[PDB]
Amino acid sequence: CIESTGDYFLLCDAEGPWGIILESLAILGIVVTILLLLAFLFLMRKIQDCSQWNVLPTQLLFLLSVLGLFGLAFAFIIELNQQTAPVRYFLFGVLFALCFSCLLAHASNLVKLVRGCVSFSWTTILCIAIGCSLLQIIIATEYVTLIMTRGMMFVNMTPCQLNVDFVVLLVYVLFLMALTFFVSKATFCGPCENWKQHGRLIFITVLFSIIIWVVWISMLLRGNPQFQRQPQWDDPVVCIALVTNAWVFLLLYIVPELCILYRS
Amino acid sequence: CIESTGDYFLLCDAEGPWGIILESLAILGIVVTILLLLAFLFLMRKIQDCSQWNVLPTQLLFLLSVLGLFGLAFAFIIELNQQTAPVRYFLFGVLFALCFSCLLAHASNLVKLVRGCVSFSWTTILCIAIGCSLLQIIIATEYVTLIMTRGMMFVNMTPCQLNVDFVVLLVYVLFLMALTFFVSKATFCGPCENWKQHGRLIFITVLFSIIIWVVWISMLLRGNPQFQRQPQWDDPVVCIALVTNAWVFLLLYIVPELCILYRS
Amino acid sequence: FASSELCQGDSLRSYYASWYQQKPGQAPVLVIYGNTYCNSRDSSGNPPVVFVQLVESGGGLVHPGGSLRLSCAASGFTFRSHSMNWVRQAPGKGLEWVSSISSDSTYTYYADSVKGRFTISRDNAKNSLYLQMNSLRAEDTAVYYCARSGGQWKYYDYWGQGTLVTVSS
Amino acid sequence: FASSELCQGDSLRSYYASWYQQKPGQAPVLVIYGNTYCNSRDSSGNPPVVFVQLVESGGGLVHPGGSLRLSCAASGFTFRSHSMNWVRQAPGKGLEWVSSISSDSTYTYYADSVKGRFTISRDNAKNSLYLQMNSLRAEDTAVYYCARSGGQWKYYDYWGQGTLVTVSS
């Protein structure tokens, strides 16, 4: 029972109806991710091969990060005037780093499981999934506290620098994405084939996830001032990118991953 | 020809003469560190043992960090009204992390050179010396830019929070010091004795430099408000701690290190 | 939804309206918040409102077909707590709606008779509200008052002093 | 270095002094910056000065032996750009120096006749200057004016309006 208006039965959404057309997608993402997480947790009971049991925690954290992305996209439309100002610049980076570091963990597991070596343990894959996200949670919990306590708050910064800081904060997850892309591109020289479909899954996912980023960040930095699309196409395009990245993660990665790690 | 007064032949230093009694020590530190760096660079020509040639870059970066500490202590008395406000919260953390990460690098080299293993290469010891400082240079170049550009600048912060952020920024180098202390304490169980004197050197240096910290940070947080010693004993005690930490590094560590790695 | 519908109107049981009073030569004030100047909330899609200190800026003398910039500088209040309302003053009927930016520059409701010639934005850094009067029209001489809404009843307790721009042929 | 040494003084070729002019009932304004009210910079170690708006605060009526807090609020200028001086006003001689906090609360030159009873500090956040008049003295009724120095000649271009604190037995 939450709308996107001025205040208390006031003028409705302008420019575009980027309200329920993202809220319903977020709700569907939450429901499907809950069901998928339940199925993936029940998957631990029936799996007998320990070669792929190692990546199960990394996929679990990817599912948790995608659930966080959907839940943030739920709280990414009310604009920067409530107490939801801190979350939009901390949780976004944290969950993006979590997801792309899980991708990097899976890529490293493929590298060390395709060229004759042995897959890392649960501890090692979990540690490498969270370690690349440690720098981002540090950077985000630094930015958010430094602004909401020391400097001038979020709700009094100009929009010309209120979304440039988004790029400034996400340069690290951009580097994480670039590292994942380079690793899964370098996976090409590999004799074993039973894990190469996972590598091509990572390659397709990161190519799509660098294409969604090569425009949207560039759009907010360049075109919205020229297209007169700010700050009205400022937040809705970010929520659109968030929800479609969450959906491409849940659909073009987790469904095919569950297809090649099927239930028998 | 630089004094510490009000402005242009005005009232001189109050409370205490913490001016030239630190400037002369800083100048002596600069001169002795320059001579020591020249001697330590000429030291590379005559050493033939590769067992200790690995730690030469780490000691070189320790010397550079101590030189930076002395140079910062030179610019740590003019107080936060000039353009030297940014450096006091970036260079201090960066150089402390550099020095204590060099100490951690030497400690790890001792760990892996006492219990029968082989000393790391130049690449590995330098990489582990700079890796622990990478997080601090990131955290400091985030803090400084976030303050001087986005939030309120340094010269309009209350002193009650203008030196608490010193602790907030240096928690990471505090953890680095704690890790160095724990590693050099764990070096006790070791069969080889030709490197255990270096371990006890690091133990003594870190014990002195954790005693130098258990009071001064505690002093700024607790006693100066009660002793009516702020912001008069705010900056001079920080510069005192800086210059005596630089001196205990250059004398309690580098001098004995050159004593047991003597010139023949 | 043409000109002024009301303050009677046979659509009262679908919204809530307010009432206002105005001393001559001064900014108006609300009388009482919450089938029979005035004010009337409506639901036309196109912006439906018809009829501690705020100061406005602008003194240019530009010929028709040119461009001019309006401003509304204010302080002493929380800029990111309510919604501003540019309103134009015309003799006779009185006040008419102009762009009504809200929150943090996320609701750009350019008025029906000016949509395309007026651009509005909300800068919460300096606590200022601007207006771009490019492509000036000769038949647009009026006083653009600056207000801040209460929101729930669309009442504007805070008001400015306007600006008498006299662009004409 | 007792009371008022000067504006003749047999130490002219060791420092530089200034001159002042004061309308009655008003804060003084410097006349010209840079062996023969007035001013005299000296080198006694103890604070040697003898003879866009600033407002002061304080209205308590405290009995002798009690405590009271003074204040000086100002804006419209760079607080962290120069030095500022508390100065007390007495009939007869005129103005006398009080604590003279500078930079960012790093130079507390409390006055010789008040050292131990007055605590000064500079707060650059809200751009305010405070004074703690604890342990009140009966023979200390005066007007404490708020100023801001120029530094190179110890001229105080900016001035306040004082505060008529009348603590007495």
Residue numbers in the entry:
A (entry chain B), B (entry chain A): 5 to 268
C (entry chain D), D (entry chain C): 37 to 42, 60 to 87, 106 to 107, 124 to 138, 171 to 288
Please quote the paper that reports this structure.
GPRC5D is an atypical Class C orphan G protein-coupled receptor. Its high expression on the surface of multiple myeloma cells has rendered it an attractive target for therapeutic interventions, including monoclonal antibodies, CAR-T cells, and T-cell engagers. While the conventional Class C GPCRs such as mGluR usually contains a large N-terminal domain named Venus flytrap (VFT) module responsible for orthosteric ligand binding and obligate homo- or hetero-dimer formation; GPRC5D, as well as the entire GPRC5 subfamily, possesses relatively small extracellular domains, comprising only 20–50 amino acids.
We finally determined the cryo-EM structure of GPRC5D-scFv150-18 complex with nominal global map at 3.34 Å resolution. Our structure unveils that the antibody extensively binds to the extracellular regions in GPRC5D, including the N-terminal region and all three extracellular loops (ECL1, ECL2, and ECL3), with an overall interface area of 911 Å2 within one copy of the GPRC5D-scFv complex or 1822 Å2 for the GPRC5D homodimer. Notably, mutations in the N-terminus almost abolished antibody binding, consistent with our structural observation that the scFv primarily binds to the N-terminus of GPRC5D. More importantly, our structural analysis reveals that despite lacking a large N-terminal extracellular VFT domain, the transmembrane domain of GPRC5D resembles closer to the Class C receptors. Taken together, we propose that GPRC5D adopts an inactive-like conformation, despite the overall low sequence similarity of activation-related motifs between GPRC5D and other Class C receptors. We identify a distinct head-to-head homodimer arrangement and interface mainly involving TM4, setting it apart from other Class C homo- or hetero-dimers. While the dimer interfaces of most Class C receptors are located in the N-terminal extracellular VFT domain, GPRC5D uniquely relies on the transmembrane region for its dimer interface.
